Amino acid sequence: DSSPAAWNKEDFPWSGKVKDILQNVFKLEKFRPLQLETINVTMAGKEVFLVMPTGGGKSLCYQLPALCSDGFTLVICPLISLMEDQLMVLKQLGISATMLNASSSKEHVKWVHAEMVNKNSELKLIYVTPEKIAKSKMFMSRLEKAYEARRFTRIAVDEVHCCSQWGHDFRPDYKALGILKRQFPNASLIGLTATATNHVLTDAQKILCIEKCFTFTASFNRPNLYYEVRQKPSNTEDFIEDIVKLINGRYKGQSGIIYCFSQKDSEQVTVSLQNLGIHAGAYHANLEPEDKTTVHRKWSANEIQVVVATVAFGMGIDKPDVRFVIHHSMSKSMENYYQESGRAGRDDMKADCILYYGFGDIFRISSMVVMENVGQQKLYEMVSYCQNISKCRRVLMAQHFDEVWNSEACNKMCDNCCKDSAFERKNITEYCRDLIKILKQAEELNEKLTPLKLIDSWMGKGAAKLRVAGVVAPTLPREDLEKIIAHFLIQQYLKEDYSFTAYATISYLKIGPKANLLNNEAHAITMQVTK
DNA sequence: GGGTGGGTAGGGTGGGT
Numbered sequence: 001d002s003s004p005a006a007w008n009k010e011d012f013p014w015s016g017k018v019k020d021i022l023q024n025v026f027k028l029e030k031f032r033p034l035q036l037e038t039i040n041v042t043m044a045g046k047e048v049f050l051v052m053p054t055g056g057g058k059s060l061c062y063q064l065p066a067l068c069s070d071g072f073t074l075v076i077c078p079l080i081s082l083m084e085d086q087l088m089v090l091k092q093l094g095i096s097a098t099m100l101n102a103s104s105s106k107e108h109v110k111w112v113h114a115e116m117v118n119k120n121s122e123l124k125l126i127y128v129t130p131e132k133i134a135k136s137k138m139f140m141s142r143l144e145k146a147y148e149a150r151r152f153t154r155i156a157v158d159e160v161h162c163c164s165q166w167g168h169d170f171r172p173d174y175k176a177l178g179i180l181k182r183q184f185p186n187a188s189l190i191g192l193t194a195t196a197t198n199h200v201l202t203d204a205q206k207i208l209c210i211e212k213c214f215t216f217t218a219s220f221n222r223p224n225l226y227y228e229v230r231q232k233p234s235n236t237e238d239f240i241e242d243i244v245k246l247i248n249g250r251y252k253g254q255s256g257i258i259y260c261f262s263q264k265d266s267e268q269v270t271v272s273l274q275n276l277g278i279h280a281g282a283y284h285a286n287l288e289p290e291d292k293t294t295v296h297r298k299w300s301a302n303e304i305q306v307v308v309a310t311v312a313f314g315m316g317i318d319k320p321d322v323r324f325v326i327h328h329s330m331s332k333s334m335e336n337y338y339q340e341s342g343r344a345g346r347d348d349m350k351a352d353c354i355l356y357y358g359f360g361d362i363f364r365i366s367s368m369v370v371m372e373n374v375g376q377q378k379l380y381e382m383v384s385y386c387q388n389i390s391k392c393r394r395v396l397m398a399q400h401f402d403e404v405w406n407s408e409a410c411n412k413m414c415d416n417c418c419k420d421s422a423f424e425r426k427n428i429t430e431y432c433r434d435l436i437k438i439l440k441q442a443e444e445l446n447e448k449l450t451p452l453k454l455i456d457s458w459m460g461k462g463a464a465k466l467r468v469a470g471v472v473a474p475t476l477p478r479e480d481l482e483k484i485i486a487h488f489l490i491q492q493y494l495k496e497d498y499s500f501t502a503y504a505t506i507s508y509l510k511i512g513p514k515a516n517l518l519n520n521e522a523h524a525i526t527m528q529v530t531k
Numbered sequence: 532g533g534g535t536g537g538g539t540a541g542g543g544t545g546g547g548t
């Protein structure tokens with residue numbers, strides 16, 4: 001990762017053009033960090049990789065250079081939806097652009113092929129899927145003619161991490177993309193990604209073969225962002241009522257994003273907010289382009305205060321003044337949470353990120369991510385973050401990314417750093433043994449306990465057939481009992497057992513690997529609690 | 532309502548189980 005700072009200047013011959021395009025065409029005041037350095041390197045003919053979090057402004061770094069020189073820029077994109085979002089932005093800006101995909105008509109393909117070799121064509125950006133490279137010789141023939149005509153002099157590979165086999169959403173189509181630099185060496189190539197471990201970037205560079213390449217990585221910490229974790233109420237109605245209290249009481253009239261586990265959750269939450277007077281609109285990539293345009297148009301004009309998006313893939317939410325981000329359910333992984341929470345405060349002003357932690361959400365996410373190899377492990381790391389009540393959120397967040405060392409001070413910008421309080425180490429060894437007795441009886445009774453059922457037996461609720469006479473009621477609030485069970489599951493005193501039913505995957509709790517340590521009478525189990 | 536109508540699939544606040 002060579003230093004961008006040498007390139008953070010506007011003394012270049014093209015600098016006047018770059019400033020002219022940025023202000024007059026893109027209607028943008030100032031470059032965001034690493035934008036200018038990335039743009040200069042591409043205009044210098046050098047290969048560059050830009051690692052920037054989603055919503056950081058990656059797209060400008062190759063759209064602007066396209067307008068600074070004659071001819072068009074080839075953009076490789078993996079998703080049709082991603083291509084559509086860029087085209088809508090470009091169309092609003094008056095920049096000529098087009099796309100090719102498998103579903104594109106024969107006539108449109110003919111037009112795009114004609115425009116590529118056309119001397120006077122107005123096209124500046126052409127977006128194609130990697131399939132059009134690997135599996136269309138006809139498109140390659142036009143591309144070769146265009147290259148020899150100097151029609152196109154640069155290439156952008158969005159989601160460049162897909163080239164590497166280790167990258168998320170690795171695509172066999174992306175493997176073939178090395179043909180580009182081999183066949184068109186004179187065209188500079190730029191790779192854009194938001195999730196980029198260093199070994200992933202080097203592998204992708206090998207695939208493209210590109211040999212020497214600048215890699216610019218955005219700073220991890222966002223000083224203006226406030227990170228908080230709140231308990232999620234057991235019912236679904238006081239929760240939305242609580243959210244409306246937060247929105248009116250602290251962010252009255254301010255834009256914000258609500259993240260939900262599922263698409264139907266976003267629709268359900270959107271209706272609930274609307275009935276309470278909050279102007280809200282659901283957004284997800286499953287939306288038709290007309291729906292996406294209307295929600296984006298309404299949100300930008302502040303006709304809609306709150307956008308309710310889905311965690312799974314929701315990511316056309318570009319607005320510089322997002323004052324708050326609220327997670328209706330906890331993120332799937334810490335890696336996802338940083339991306340989702342990082343939408344807020346792109347204007348660099350103070351913004352709040354509130355995560356609502358719920359015991360039920362743990363198992364709902366666990367069943368979904370069962371096929372993922374590390375899905376449970378990534379989720380359990382997220383659970384640990386919610387559990388913690390003393391450590392600074394930035395320190396906790398940093399520890400989940402070995403790729404970044406963040407020494408920046410919190411400056412009272414998280415719930416734990418804020419709040420001066422004292423903590424003990426409450427013993428919970430007795431509680432763990434009591435839960436084991438309930439579980440052991442179930443195994444002999446050949447019945448599986450859901451976490452809901454297991455907690456019911458502990459408190460004296462539920463079917464009496466799943467009871468131990470000697471187990472006394474915890475005499476603690478139910479939410480506290482959920483945390484104790486969650487702590488045991490994290491520590492592997494309990495383990496999740498998954499049942500595959502026809503309807504859905506179901507999580508059941510079972511005796512964990514570490515329960516045999518309870519045989520030692522001197523063994524103790526403790527957890528942080530406020531005094 | 533019925534399970535040869537289907538559950539990589541429509542979803543469980545649609546209802547029976």
Ligand SMILES: Nc1ncnc2c1ncn2[C@@H]1O[C@H](COP(=O)(O)OP(=O)(O)O)[C@@H](O)[C@H]1O
Pocket residue numbers: 028029030031032035052053054055056057058059060318319320
């Ligand atoms: N220099 C800048 N100043 C202000 N806003 C910017 C700048 N660069 C990009 N943006 C805005 O950030 C938003 C998100 O950028 P996007 O192209 O989605 O980046 P990414 O590819 O990282 O998601 C866009 O709406 C864009 O208008």
Ligand SMILES: [K+]
Pocket residue numbers: 059060063089
């Ligand atoms: K843009």
Ligand SMILES: [K+]
Pocket residue numbers: none
């Ligand atoms: K049914």
Ligand SMILES: [K+]
Pocket residue numbers: none
């Ligand atoms: K039906």
Ligand SMILES: [K+]
Pocket residue numbers: none
């Ligand atoms: K049915």
Ligand SMILES: [Mg+2]
Pocket residue numbers: 054055058059
């Ligand atoms: Mg992007």
Ligand SMILES: [Zn+2]
Pocket residue numbers: 391392393394410411412413414415416417418
């Ligand atoms: Zn802190």
